[PDB]
Amino acid sequence: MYTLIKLTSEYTSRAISFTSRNFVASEPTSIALKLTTCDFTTSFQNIMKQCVDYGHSFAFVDADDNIKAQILNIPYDAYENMHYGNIRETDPMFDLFGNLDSYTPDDKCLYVFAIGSEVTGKGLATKLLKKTIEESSSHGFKYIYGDCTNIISQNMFEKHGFETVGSVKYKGYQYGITKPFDSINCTEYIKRMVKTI
Ligand SMILES: CC(C)(COP(=O)(O)OP(=O)(O)OC[C@H]1O[C@@H](n2cnc3c(N)ncnc32)[C@H](O)[C@@H]1OP(=O)(O)O)[C@@H](O)C(=O)NCCC(=O)NCCS
């Protein structure tokens, strides 16, 4: 069926594409901003590559080694110093997320940049999150942080012991005179969620 793997460098191109496509198709903030995969890859390919290279990311692959679900994780200290391919299309995204960067870890922390699954309702994302919790413990991380934009992942994180430490309401959020997130209907907040290991 599908095999749980630790992502390695040979999967980098597949990992970048998987999250780009998955988020552009199905993640609330990307959809709200009408991002294309070009927009997403430009802004986020660096962090996605680093999620693979730091060694703490996981995926489910099919028999032909295609990624069907993945979780891209990176140490928080690398996240805090991350560079992005900034473009006008994603400026409001960075503005929104920036609000959550005020709650910071006081010890070793693993940051979940992205979780996604193209084969849904089969437990794949849940299993990736549980694997990530095991990984965090094994490497002496004290916290896992995620900025979760989707009610589905918020509930999943809650089910696995995460607590909300910060939030921003989508409806009414402004970037200058624009209201770029008012189109979101599935989810009311973006939330920074923290699990203490
Ligand atoms: C969110 C996402 C990762 C879920 O992955 P998935 O593999 O279906 O999730 P799992 O099957 O492990 O299911 C996890 C839980 O979500 C629930 N769930 C999954 N899809 C759901 C849906 N469309 N509506 C309501 N609940 C849903 C499951 O029922 C399950 O809960 P339970 O076990 O308590 O019943 C997937 O929908 C996705 O990739 N979305 C685009 C990506 C995204 O937005 N990522 C998060 C950004 S924070």
Side-chain angles (χ1 to χ4, degrees), residues 2-87 89-197:
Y2 308 110
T3 304
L4 176 60
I5 68 161
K6 190 181 294 182
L7 283 168
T8 63
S9 60
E10 68 181 330
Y11 290 86
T12 302
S13 300
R14 286 168 282 189
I16 287 165
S17 178
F18 177 89
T19 287
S20 296
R21 294 179 288 116
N22 170 243
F23 274 26
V24 158
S26 301
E27 183 279 316
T29 60
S30 295
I31 290 165
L33 295 182
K34 301 175 187 304
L35 302 186
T36 65
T37 56
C38 295
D39 298 330
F40 196 95
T41 293
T42 292
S43 290
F44 298 109
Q45 65 179 326
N46 179 41
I47 186 163
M48 295 191 283
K49 178 170 196 303
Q50 294 193 37
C51 288
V52 174
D53 292 341
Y54 275 98
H56 301 303
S57 298
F58 300 91
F60 276 98
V61 296
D62 70 11
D64 290 286
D65 217 24
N66 303 304
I67 299 175
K68 299 282 131 187
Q70 73 183 8
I71 189 168
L72 298 185
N73 304 313
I74 190 177
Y76 195 91
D77 71 348
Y79 162 77
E80 61 179 352
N81 291 312
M82 188 56 56
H83 286 267
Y84 302 91
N86 294 291
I87 49 174
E89 290 79 1
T90 58
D91 285 342
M93 203 188 258
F94 291 107
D95 187 77
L96 177 68
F97 275 69
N99 300 279
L100 300 166
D101 284 330
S102 74
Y103 191 102
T104 59
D106 64 7
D107 207 334
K108 195 176 175 168
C109 174
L110 191 65
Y111 183 79
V112 181
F113 168 70
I115 193 174
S117 172
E118 282 181 344
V119 176
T120 57
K122 293 201 181 297
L124 300 187
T126 295
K127 287 171 183 175
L128 290 165
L129 182 59
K130 289 183 185 180
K131 184 67 173 181
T132 295
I133 291 158
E134 296 176 4
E135 178 73 0
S136 298
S137 184
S138 292
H139 285 271
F141 290 95
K142 298 292 180 65
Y143 304 106
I144 306 172
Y145 276 42
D147 295 319
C148 301
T149 57
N150 192 330
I151 186 62
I152 301 167
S153 57
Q154 288 166 5
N155 290 337
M156 180 183 337
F157 277 51
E158 285 164 352
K159 200 180 184 187
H160 299 83
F162 285 76
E163 296 181 300
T164 292
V165 300
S167 65
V168 184
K169 186 185 294 195
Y170 293 131
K171 194 77 59 168
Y173 189 81
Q174 290 189 38
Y175 186 66
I177 62 167
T178 74
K179 293 176 179 177
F181 306 109
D182 275 17
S183 64
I184 298 174
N185 295 131
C186 62
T187 304
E188 288 172 27
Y189 293 85
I190 183 175
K191 294 187 168 189
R192 176 161 281 203
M193 306 186 81
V194 178
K195 183 180 173 74
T196 305
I197 296 294

